Amino acid sequence: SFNKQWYLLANQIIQSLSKYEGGHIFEKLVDAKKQNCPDYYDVIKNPMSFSCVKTKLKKGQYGLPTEFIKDVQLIFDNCSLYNTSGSLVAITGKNIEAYFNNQLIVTGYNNFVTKANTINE
Ligand SMILES: Cc1[nH]c(-c2ccccc2C(F)(F)F)c2c1C(=O)CCCC2
Ligand SMILES: [Cl-]
């Protein structure tokens, strides 16, 4: 059914991000002390990781396909906010962001976004 179909696609997309070269740095929430960034949660007020999104998909927390996108994009927005442009981490976030936006097209996920935006308008 409709929601089952884009839940399955979102699970496939998120797993492809996890397996992207360097994607492991977004898999879990940043450990401020262990990663030597003690000010991280002073800057990032809405943290997000791939495993957070996977948990929301597993538990059924998303009601609209755009909610999945907003969370994944939040990962990359947090990355660009905290990390200086050109740094290793910022470069990796820009790369996976571009990969994610292309996957939303080639999988057809954006088609579910368009349908759902019309249903709930
Ligand atoms: C998105 C993000 N991920 C990681 C991370 C996590 C676990 C292992 C390794 C890393 C790292 F290599 F990227 F640093 C960090 C991070 C930041 O925003 C802060 C800068 C460095 C820490
Ligand atoms: Cl690493």
Given the structure tokens 């990663």, which residue do they identify? Answer: 35
Shortest-distance Cα residue to atom 2 of ligand 1: 25
Ligand 1 within 6 A of CB of 74: no
| Selection from 121, 93, 86 nearest residue 30 by Cα | 93
Which resolution, in Å, applies to this structure? 1.9
Q: Which ligand is nearest to the CA of 31?
A: 1
The dihedrals phi and psi of 115, each to the nearest 5 degrees, come to -60, -45
Residue 87 lies in domain: 2-119
Given the structure tokens 């057809």, which residue do they identify? Answer: 108
Terminal-residue alpha carbon distance, the chain: 20
Q: How many domains does the chain have?
A: 1
| Selection from 103, 84, 95, 105 nearest residue 15 by Cα | 103
List of long-range contacts for 40-49, beta carbons under 8 Å, 24+ apart = 40/82, 43/81, 43/82, 44/78, 44/81, 44/82, 46/74, 46/78, 47/78, 48/72, 48/74, 48/75, 48/78, 49/75
Atom of ligand 1 nearest to the CA of 93: 1
Do 16 and 102 meet the contact criterion of CB atoms below 8 Å apart?
Answer: no
CA angle 40, 82, 11 (to 5 degrees): 90
* CATH number of the domain where residue 98 is located: 1.20.920.10
Q: Which of 21, 45, 89, 95 to mutate to test the pocket of ligand 1 (most atoms within 8 A of CB)?
A: 89
Atom of ligand 1 nearest to the CA of 35: 22
Q: Which ligand is nearest to the CA of 49?
A: 1
HEC string of the chain equals CHHHHHHHHHHHHHHHHHHCCCHHHHCCCCCCCCCCCCCHHHHCCCCCCHHHHHHHHHHCCCCCHHHHHHHHHHHHHHHHHHCCCCCHHHHHHHHHHHHHHHHHHHCCHHHHHHHHHHHCC
Two tokens at 113? 């976004």
